Tab-separated table of C-alpha atoms in Angstrom:
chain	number	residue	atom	x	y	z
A	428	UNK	CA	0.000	0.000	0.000
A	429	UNK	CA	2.371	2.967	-1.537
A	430	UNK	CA	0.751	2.972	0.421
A	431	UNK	CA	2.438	2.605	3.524
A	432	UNK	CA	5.891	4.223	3.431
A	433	UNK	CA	9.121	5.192	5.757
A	434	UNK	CA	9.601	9.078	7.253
A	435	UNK	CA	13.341	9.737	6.483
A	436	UNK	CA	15.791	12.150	7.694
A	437	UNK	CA	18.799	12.508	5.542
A	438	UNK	CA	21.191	14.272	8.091
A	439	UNK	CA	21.030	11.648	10.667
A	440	UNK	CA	19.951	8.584	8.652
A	441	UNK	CA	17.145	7.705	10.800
A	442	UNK	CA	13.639	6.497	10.556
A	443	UNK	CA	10.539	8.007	12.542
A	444	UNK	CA	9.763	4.706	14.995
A	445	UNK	CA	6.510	4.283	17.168
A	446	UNK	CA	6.847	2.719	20.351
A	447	UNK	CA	3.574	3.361	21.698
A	448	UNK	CA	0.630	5.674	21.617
A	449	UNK	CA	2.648	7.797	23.952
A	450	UNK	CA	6.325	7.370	22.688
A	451	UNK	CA	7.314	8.236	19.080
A	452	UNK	CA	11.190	8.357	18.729
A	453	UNK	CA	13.422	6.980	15.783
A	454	UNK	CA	15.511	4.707	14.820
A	455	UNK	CA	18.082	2.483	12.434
A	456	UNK	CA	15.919	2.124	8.889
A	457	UNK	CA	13.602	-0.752	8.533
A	458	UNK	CA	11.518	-1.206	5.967
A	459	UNK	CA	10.262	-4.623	7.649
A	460	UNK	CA	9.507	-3.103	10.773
A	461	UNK	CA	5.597	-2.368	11.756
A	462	UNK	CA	6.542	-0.237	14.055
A	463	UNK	CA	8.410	2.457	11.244
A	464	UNK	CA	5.754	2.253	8.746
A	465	UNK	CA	3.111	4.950	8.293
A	466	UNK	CA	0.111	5.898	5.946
A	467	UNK	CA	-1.861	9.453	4.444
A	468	UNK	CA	-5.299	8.521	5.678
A	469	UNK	CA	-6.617	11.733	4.611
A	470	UNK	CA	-5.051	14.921	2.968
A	471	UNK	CA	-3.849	15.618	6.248
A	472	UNK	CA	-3.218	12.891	8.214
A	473	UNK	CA	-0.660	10.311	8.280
A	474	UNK	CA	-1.617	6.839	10.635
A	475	UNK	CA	0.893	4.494	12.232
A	476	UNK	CA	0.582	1.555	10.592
A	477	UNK	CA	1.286	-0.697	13.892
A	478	UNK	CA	-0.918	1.352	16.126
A	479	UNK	CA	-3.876	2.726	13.721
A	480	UNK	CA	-3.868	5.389	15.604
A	481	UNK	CA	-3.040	9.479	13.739
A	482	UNK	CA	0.725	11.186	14.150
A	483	UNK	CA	-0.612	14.687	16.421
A	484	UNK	CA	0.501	17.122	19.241
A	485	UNK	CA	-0.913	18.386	22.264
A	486	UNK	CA	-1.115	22.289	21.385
A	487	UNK	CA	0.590	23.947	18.354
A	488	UNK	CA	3.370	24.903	20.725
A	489	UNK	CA	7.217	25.357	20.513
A	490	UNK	CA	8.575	21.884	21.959
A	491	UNK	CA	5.142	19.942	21.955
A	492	UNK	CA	5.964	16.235	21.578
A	493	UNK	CA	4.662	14.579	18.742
A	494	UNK	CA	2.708	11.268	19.481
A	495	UNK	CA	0.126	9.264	18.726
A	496	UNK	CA	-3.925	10.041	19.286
A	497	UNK	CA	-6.991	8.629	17.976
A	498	UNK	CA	-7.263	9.443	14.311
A	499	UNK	CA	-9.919	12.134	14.162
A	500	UNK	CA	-10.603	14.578	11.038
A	501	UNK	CA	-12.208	17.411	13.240
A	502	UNK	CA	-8.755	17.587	15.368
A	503	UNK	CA	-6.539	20.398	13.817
A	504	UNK	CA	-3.979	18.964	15.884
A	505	UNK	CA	-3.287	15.999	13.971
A	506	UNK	CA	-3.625	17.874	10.479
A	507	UNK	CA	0.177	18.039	8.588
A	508	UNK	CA	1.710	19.598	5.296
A	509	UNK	CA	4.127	20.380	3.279
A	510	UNK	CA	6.228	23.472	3.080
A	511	UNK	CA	9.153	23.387	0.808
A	512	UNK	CA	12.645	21.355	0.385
A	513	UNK	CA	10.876	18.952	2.581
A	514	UNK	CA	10.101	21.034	5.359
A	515	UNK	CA	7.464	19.359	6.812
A	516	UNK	CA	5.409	20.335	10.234
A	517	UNK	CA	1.784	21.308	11.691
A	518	UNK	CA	-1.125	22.571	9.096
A	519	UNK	CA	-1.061	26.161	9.070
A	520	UNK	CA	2.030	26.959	11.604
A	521	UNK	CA	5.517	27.583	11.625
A	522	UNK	CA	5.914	24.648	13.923
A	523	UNK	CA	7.926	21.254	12.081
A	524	UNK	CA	8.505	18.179	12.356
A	525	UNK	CA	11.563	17.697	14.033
A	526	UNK	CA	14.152	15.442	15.646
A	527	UNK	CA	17.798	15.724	17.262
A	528	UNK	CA	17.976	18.795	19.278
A	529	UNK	CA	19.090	18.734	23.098
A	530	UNK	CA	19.419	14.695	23.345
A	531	UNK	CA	15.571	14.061	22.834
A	532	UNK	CA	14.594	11.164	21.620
A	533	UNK	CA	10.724	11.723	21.247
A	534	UNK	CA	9.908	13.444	17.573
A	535	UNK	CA	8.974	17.298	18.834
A	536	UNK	CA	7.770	20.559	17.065
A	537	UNK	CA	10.251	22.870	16.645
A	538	UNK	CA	10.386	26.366	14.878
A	539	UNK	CA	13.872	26.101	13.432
A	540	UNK	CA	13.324	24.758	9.765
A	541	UNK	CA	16.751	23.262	9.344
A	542	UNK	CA	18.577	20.002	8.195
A	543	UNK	CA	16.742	18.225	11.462
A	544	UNK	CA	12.853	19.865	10.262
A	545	UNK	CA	13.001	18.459	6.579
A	546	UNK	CA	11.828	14.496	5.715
A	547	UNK	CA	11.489	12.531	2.835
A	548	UNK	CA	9.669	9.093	1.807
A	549	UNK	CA	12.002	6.418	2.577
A	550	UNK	CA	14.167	5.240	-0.895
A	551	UNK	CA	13.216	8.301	-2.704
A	552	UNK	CA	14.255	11.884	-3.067
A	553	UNK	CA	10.694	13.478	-1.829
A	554	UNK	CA	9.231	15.012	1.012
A	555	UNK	CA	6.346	13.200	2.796
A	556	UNK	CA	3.661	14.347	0.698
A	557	UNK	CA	4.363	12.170	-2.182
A	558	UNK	CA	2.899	9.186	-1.044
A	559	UNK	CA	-0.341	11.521	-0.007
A	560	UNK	CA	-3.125	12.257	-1.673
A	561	UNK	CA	-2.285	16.181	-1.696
């Protein structure tokens, strides 16, 4: 299922990883493992494969960890997109994906948009988006 696909960070050569509903961190590149594989289920949402359950925050905030919640298409705070050279982060604010800053391992939003903001689809050269229906 192109459909279901790898989040990839170039600089470190790391994979998003879900380790529970509360705990999303990264790890070593799998493409067998459950746990690292995700899926759009919406033009705004992306679903862990192993937990069915939709990538979201807490509040749009600086440093709000980035988890897992209940896949719900009313909830702003599970909507993504697409800004550009990968950039990727929270629909409608300068908050992005991001991982690698002060030792923590949990996937947090952050507003610097550099190296550690931008992802791409496993084995390819695009961001996130591409395996989307956006």
């Amino acid at each position: 299922d192109a459909r279901q696909f790898l989040i990839y960070n170039e600089d470190h050569k790391r994979c998003v990883d879900a380790l529970s509903a509360i705990s999303v961190q990264t790890a070593t590149c799998n493409p067998e493992a459950e746990s690292q594989k995700f899926r759009w289920v919406s033009d705004s949402q992306i679903m862990s494969v192993a937990f069915k359950l939709c990538l979201g925050v807490p509040s749009k905030t600086d440093w709000a960890s980035v988890t897992l919640y209940a896949c719900d298409s009313k909830s702003e705070y599970q909507k993504w997109e697409c800004k550009n050279d990968t950039l990727f982060g929270i629909k409608g604010t300068e908050l992005y994906f991001n991982y690698g800053n002060r030792q923590e391992k949990n996937i947090k939003l952050y507003k610097g948009s550099g190296l550690w903001s931008r992802w791409k689809v496993y084995g390819t050269t695009d961001d996130l988006c591409s395996r989307g229906y956006e």
